Chain length 108, copies 3
């Protein structure tokens, strides 16, 4: 299956989890990180020009999803997360060799 | 190579760490993430320690087994392990590739 | 499109963010982690397209090496797809 990793605004988090519950995607982890979207060129007297790179509070979700659920998950997220402004986040779909459920001690 | 992402109970982090070392495993990196989705406790998020071992093909099963052994408790919320492909892993200090 | 996950020293964070800025990276996330007896480290995650992978690993290696143990590691992973949330556009359209 696949491992999805999405960076979403913090204020947009519940809107995302609500969307994910509706999509039937129960079971994921999250944590805050710091992300980057845009900059601003700054010219000055001392050492003139300097490029300001801004980092923002963001939430990284890491859902593991079966193939039939990649499109639903991504869609649910793009929609639940979109704002239209700079810094809305990003989604990555990654290859997952195996996924063991520590409990049972098996896969699935 | 492979990158093993282990999501375990903070309570079992120590055993998993002991099991992974008696199994010759370093380079490991970890952090805190939270799970979602006579008395009772109940929260929306559950504390988990997220391990992250980059490993060689030989020790992929040793790592995964050491972890599955040190983390299983039979209770829901035990966590999971993702074995993920890795195309090329470099060591910043010396600049290597298969280690 | 690849996913580059790099673990670097706190003290060498800015030097890399600088090097990545020059590598033409325009999107990346970072968080604090502990390497391993635990040590303080910064975990960076940049999604980059093929043309820039080789160049980005180099910019990091140069920028994060001090010689001592614990400089960190750089992993390169396969990415199925990348979506810029703001626009919904895939991969390259979701980079730079």
């Amino acid at each position: 299956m696949k491992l999805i990793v999405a960076i979403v605004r913090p204020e947009k988090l519940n809107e995302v989890l609500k969307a994910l519950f509706q999509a039937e995607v129960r079971g994921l982890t999250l944590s805050r990180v710091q992300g980057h979207g845009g900059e601003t060129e700054r010219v000055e007297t001392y050492r003139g020009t300097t490029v300001k790179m801004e980092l923002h509070e963001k939430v990284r979700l890491e859902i593991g999803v079966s193939e039939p659920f990649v499109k639903p998950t991504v869609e649910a997220i793009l929609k639940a997360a979109r704002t239209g402004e700079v810094g809305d986040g990003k989604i990555f779909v990654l290859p997952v060799e195996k996924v063991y459920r520590i409990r049972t001690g098996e896969e699935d």
